[PDB]
């Protein structure tokens, strides 16, 4: 039906923010997305601002693959860049999103995410290709994919301000005032 109420735990997703911030801030998102490349170009950067830069707010990205081929391939990158170089993923992150165009046949592929790679991080190349093609972090996308069906999300993204789900994620009042409301709260 609806994605459930709760809050969805963010062990082993990457983060954004001060360890001790009240709010938590998750987003069930997805590369292919373009509901995700408008949330991360148009209202992430407002979060962050208002609340991520002054310790208020923690933000997560857990991986959706609802566009196919290109989706696991995006996630499996993203999950390795994730580990092995945590702090320049939210750089990769932005990027992927950035690239992401407004047509849509497929254009995920292993060159593009290997250059990324390259400009972002401290990851080489063909790591992280060699890397997609044996697939080595499918556990980590399968986990991912495990908590999508746990709060049974239904469409990308999909944002949790802690148990709280936002009705829609380019409402920036809804997002603010609800962001807001916790913090009280706490």
């Given at each position: 039906n609806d994605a459930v109420s709760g809050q969805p735990s963010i062990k082993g997703q990457?983060?954004?923010?001060?360890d001790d911030a009240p709010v938590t801030v998750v987003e069930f998102g997805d590369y292919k997305c373009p509901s995700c490349?408008?949330?991360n170009s148009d209202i992430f950067p407002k979060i962050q601002k208002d609340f991520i830069d002054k310790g208020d707010v923690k933000?997560?990205?857990?991986?959706?693959?609802?566009?196919?081929?290109?989706?696991?391939l995006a996630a499996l990158a993203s999950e390795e860049v994730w580990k092995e170089d945590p702090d320049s993923?939210?750089?990769?992150?932005?990027?992927?999103?950035?690239?992401?165009?407004?047509?849509?046949?497929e254009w995920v592929t292993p060159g593009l995410l290997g250059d990324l790679a390259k400009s972002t991080t401290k990851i080489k190349p063909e790591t992280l290709k060699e890397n997609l093609d044996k697939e080595?972090?499918?556990?980590?996308?399968?986990?991912?994919?495990?908590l999508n069906q746990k709060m049974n999300i239904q469409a990308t993204p999909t944002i949790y301000v802690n148990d709280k789900?936002?009705?829609?994620?380019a409402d920036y009042d809804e997002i603010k005032e609800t962001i807001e409301k916790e913090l009280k709260g706490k």
């Open positions: 990457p983060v954004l923010g001060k490349k408008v949330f933000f997560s990205f857990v991986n959706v693959m609802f566009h196919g081929k290109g989706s696991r993923f939210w750089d990769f992150h932005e990027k992927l999103f950035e690239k992401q165009p407004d047509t849509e046949q080595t972090f499918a556990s980590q996308v399968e986990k991912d994919s495990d789900v936002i009705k829609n994620f």
